[PDB]
Ligand binder design. Structure first.
Ligand SMILES: O=c1[nH]c(Nc2ccccc2)nc2c1ncn2CCCCO
Ligand SMILES: O=c1[nH]c(Nc2ccccc2)nc2c1ncn2CCCCO
Lengths: 304, 300
């Protein structure tokens, strides 16, 4: 059976990620863009604009935390829908791990919708930690060959960039920018932590390269009063969601891409990272064409 | 590897499922009432019924209602998602069972049936509904679902006898939900006899007619392009639904009888349920601990 190379470029918004995925493709390679048309029209009306307004009305003391949460949470569901459908449709085509016959470059991974942004909004106070763990419990099983590229960019440059690379409905909120950057840095450490054999349950009381301190992983965000029982321990339901989190992240192949450079520099840097990435076989011979069409149809219908 | 038997008692609420299950190498995992009332959020059922009421009364709009209603389904289904997640690794291939697990509801009640009924009640968008559908976990081997049977008025009698905290006796919601489970049963038989929704879709414009399956609910205007075509994103979500439901094993329990009988009935259906092996030697004890701990912590 032919082989497939899947690469999900992810990380905080505003680093020039979407531009370099396109440059890469401009060079048997297909792109799955951000489903902007779904966010703007098909799933709901101006979801991004709705998200920024709600957070703003919250920070302004114009709505309550509960009003904000109800709105922020439903908005997250609309944002992640195209990501879940894509994963569920692609799943039965992915075979065991292995020039690929096909290279699929995705603009973000389901965890951006089911973990990272919801965690950042929790930090921003417009979502509850229980809702964040409900999304995490729904993260789909990690398929073989899940290569994820996370980006790095100094904060001052990112700030400067953001004042440029905004989004229709987006308001420049640097508290949110800081939150999302911290959430993705914790993600990176968590994968490291897990692959070095870390056990969050063993290290709970304590709340490439060497094994990170659990306090430097995502597990640290879930030490909130709402999830702790009278005896000070986490309720079993919340703890099992962390077991799920650990299970999902430990089989992923994470890489860091430096965005503090020109678009062409980023493309070439990503191109070399692409050599040491895990491929998989496809489950059937006609998987490649079928997969080619899914990406192109998704792109055509939702790219914007 | 020892064998396990999972049984998910599902269907519209208020038919006597727990009355029968509590009269029943076998653990029972109750519904997560404490999570709904306290752990996940404060009084989730009250919030759900109050919001619909307000919308019914015109005190709020369809959009305000949808945001609150959708957000609440997330709290309602959480314990079911984690449970399926943590259990999945232990389930082996199709196979007296070492253990029998009687679950109070399957994730599809939370990620498909209730959201669908709420859409049918005007307080949930069909796009939000297909997002929950897209997240339904893969159907593990040996997934046996028991659905209820009961004439509407006896069901209304039964419902009146057991309101949950914050619930308001809504006959429109009772019909919506009954409709959804009826369609659900027809949908499984449709898929099992070889039905292809994409092929039978035009009909909306030996197996049940697609008009009597869950597919008919998604011929909703919000999901269609100007030419009437379903957008591919939604079509892909319908492909997932078809995939998840076809491999389920459905069993019908007549509730229109006595608790002794209903309970007797449940035990008889057990003979045609499919068993599976567990994945490790230590799977049985761990699955046992999981069930007792879920019950102890979230069963009220
Ligand atoms: O609250 C938020 N949720 C999500 N979810 C999300 C889901 C899938 C892919 C990308 C983002 N994204 C947010 C939010 N605020 C700003 N953004 C970034 C918006 C621009 C993403 O291009
Ligand atoms: O909007 C609703 N959503 C759900 N979701 C739900 C989630 C998991 C298990 C059962 C139901 N349940 C609802 C709703 N209204 C009434 N009920 C019934 C509550 C009592 C179930 O016995």
């Amino acid at each position: 059976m032919p082989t497939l190379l899947r690469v999900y470029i992810d990380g905080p918004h505003g680093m020039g990620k979407t531009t370099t995925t396109q440059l890469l493709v401009a060079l048997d390679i297909v792109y799955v863009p951000e489903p902007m048309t779904y966010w703007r029209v098909l799933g709901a009306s101006e979801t991004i604009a709705n998200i920024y307004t709600t957070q703003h009305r919250l920070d302004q003391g114009e709505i309550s935390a509960g009003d904000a949460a109800v709105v922020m949470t439903s908005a997250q569901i609309t944002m992640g829908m195209p990501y879940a459908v894509t994963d569920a449709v692609l799943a039965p085509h992915i075979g065991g791990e292995a020039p690929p016959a096909l290279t699929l470059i995705f603009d973000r991974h389901p965890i951006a919708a089911l973990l990272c942004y919801p965690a950042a909004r929790y930090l921003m106070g417009s979502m509850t930690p229980q809702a964040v763990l409900a999304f995490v419990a729904l993260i789909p099983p990690t398929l073989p060959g899940t290569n994820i590229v996370l980006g790095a960019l100094p904060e001052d440059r990112h700030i400067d960039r953001l004042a440029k690379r905004q989004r229709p409905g987006e308001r420049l909120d640097l508290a949110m920018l800081a939150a999302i950057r911290r959430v993705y840095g914790l993600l990176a450490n968590t994968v490291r932590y897990l692959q070095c054999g870390g056990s969050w349950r063993e290290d709970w009381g304590q709340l490439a390269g060497p094994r990170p301190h659990i306090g430097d992983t995502l597990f640290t965000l879930f030490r909130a009063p709402e999830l702790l029982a009278p005896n000070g321990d986490l309720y079993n339901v919340f703890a099992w969601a962390l077991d799920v989190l650990a299970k999902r992240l430990r089989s992923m192949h994470v890489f860091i891409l430096d965005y503090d450079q020109s678009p062409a520099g980023c493309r070439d840097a990503l191109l070399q990272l692409t050599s040491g990435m895990v491929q998989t076989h496809v489950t059937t011979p006609g998987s490649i064409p079928t997969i080619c069409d899914l990406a192109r149809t998704f792109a055509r219908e939702m790219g914007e």
